[PDB]
Design an enzyme around this catalytic site. Structure first.
Site, PDB file in Angstrom:
ATOM      1  N   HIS A 111     134.542 -39.027  15.358  1.00  0.00           N
ATOM      2  CA  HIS A 111     133.786 -38.214  16.298  1.00  0.00           C
ATOM      3  C   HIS A 111     134.624 -37.844  17.541  1.00  0.00           C
ATOM      4  O   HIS A 111     134.492 -38.460  18.630  1.00  0.00           O
ATOM      5  CB  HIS A 111     132.509 -38.975  16.701  1.00  0.00           C
ATOM      6  CG  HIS A 111     131.456 -38.120  17.346  1.00  0.00           C
ATOM      7  ND1 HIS A 111     131.548 -37.676  18.648  1.00  0.00           N
ATOM      8  CD2 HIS A 111     130.276 -37.645  16.873  1.00  0.00           C
ATOM      9  CE1 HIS A 111     130.474 -36.962  18.948  1.00  0.00           C
ATOM     10  NE2 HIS A 111     129.688 -36.927  17.888  1.00  0.00           N
ATOM     11  N   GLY A 130     126.635 -38.649  22.061  1.00  0.00           N
ATOM     12  CA  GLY A 130     125.425 -38.603  22.859  1.00  0.00           C
ATOM     13  C   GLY A 130     124.413 -39.658  22.490  1.00  0.00           C
ATOM     14  O   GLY A 130     123.833 -40.301  23.369  1.00  0.00           O
ATOM     15  N   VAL A 131     124.191 -39.880  21.202  1.00  0.00           N
ATOM     16  CA  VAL A 131     123.220 -40.908  20.827  1.00  0.00           C
ATOM     17  C   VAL A 131     123.646 -42.332  21.247  1.00  0.00           C
ATOM     18  O   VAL A 131     122.801 -43.204  21.432  1.00  0.00           O
ATOM     19  CB  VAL A 131     122.935 -40.868  19.305  1.00  0.00           C
ATOM     20  CG1 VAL A 131     122.314 -39.514  18.928  1.00  0.00           C
ATOM     21  CG2 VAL A 131     124.215 -41.117  18.490  1.00  0.00           C
TER      22      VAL A 131
END
Lengths: 150, 81, 151
Positions: free
Chosen positions: A50, A59-60
């Site tokens: 990522h 983001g999570v």
């Protein structure tokens, strides 16, 4: 206390590698707020995926980091620093709302979580706040939790 | 007709206010979304879509990008009613 | 095409291990909806940390899976299965809303992603739907994403 280190976090939170996303707690005003942070380094497995050649902290996991902070607050606000009963309690989040992502988070960033207790009726905790890098706001989120029996 | 426009502007104000967490009193036709109202890029995108929903219209990015102040978006909504 | 396997997903999504969280696409309707899934197994690194002796798939990774499914839909809706034009954008996660977790997800579960398009204008995509295991909803979410030139 008001400042907590990884040794301490490890005694309250049940999360371990690679899902413990809080490194240090700098401010803890019981029942009202917490300030904690996670260092973001390239040397994290998540940046393998990522994304290749463009490390961006997902983001999570920012949200999961805030949640873990919120959960450290809730537990200490109601039992103080007590590892012993931490062994029998886990703060479970059930909802997530008003999440916004404004600035990409990258290796070299100190990701600060600031969470303030929004409401605390009955057995439902609600926290909300922001995640920050160098004063700026990178993300915001609002969450509800309850404290459970491991 | 004049009273229509005024009431319409009062509705546009409320959306902008609510969206950008700002007092309606700050949402003047002059006020610029970025500079005066403290909106970043995501704020502007969510604002456009919010206005698009509320007044049931659509705005192409070629003309959404021209707008700077609330007056621009007001005049836009009045044309496409 | 309506059914895409991991080989297809790899050509479209930029995500790689350990952050590729869609295994297969079972249903796709351009500009409308998608059904995909991820298998959940004990042999995943997450479960070392979440939690020792009690494997529970992190709710935020369920949301991430859904977002990834939503992303696949947005791309192939606009450009079809084009691996080459895939390699000129990555997809940015803008907002998340109305997330509710209902049932824990564990090793052995097949985790299905059901996403409807709620709105899309050009490059911004807003989708919402559920995560299911065995025809029961385990989670809900709405989210908004936009497409960005990659690396």
């Amino acid at each position: 206390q008001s400042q907590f280190f990884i040794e301490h976090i490890l005694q309250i939170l049940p999360h371990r590698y690679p899902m413990l996303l809080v490194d240090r707690i700098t401010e803890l005003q019981a029942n009202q707020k917490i300030v904690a942070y996670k260092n973001i380094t390239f040397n994290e497995d998540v940046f393998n995926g990522h994304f290749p050649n463009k490390p961006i902290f997902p983001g999570v996991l920012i949200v999961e980091g805030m949640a873990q902070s919120g959960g450290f607050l809730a537990f200490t606000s109601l039992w103080g620093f007590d590892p012993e009963i931490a062994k029998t309690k886990i703060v479970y989040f059930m909802t997530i709302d008003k999440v916004k992502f404004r600035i990409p988070v990258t290796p070299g960033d100190r990701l600060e979580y600031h969470l303030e207790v929004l409401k605390h009726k009955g057995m439902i905790w609600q926290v909300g706040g922001t995640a920050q890098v160098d004063g700026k706001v990178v993300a915001e989120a609002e969450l509800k939790a309850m404290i459970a029996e491991r | 007709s004049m009273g229509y426009l005024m009431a319409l502007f009062e509705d546009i104000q409320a959306v902008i206010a609510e969206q950008l967490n700002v007092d309606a009193a700050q949402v003047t036709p002059e006020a610029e979304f970025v500079k005066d109202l403290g909106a970043d890029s995501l704020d502007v995108v969510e604002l456009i879509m919010a206005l698009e929903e509320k007044f049931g219209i659509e705005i192409p990015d070629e003309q959404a990008e021209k707008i700077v102040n609330v007056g621009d978006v007001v005049k836009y909504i009045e044309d496409n009613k």
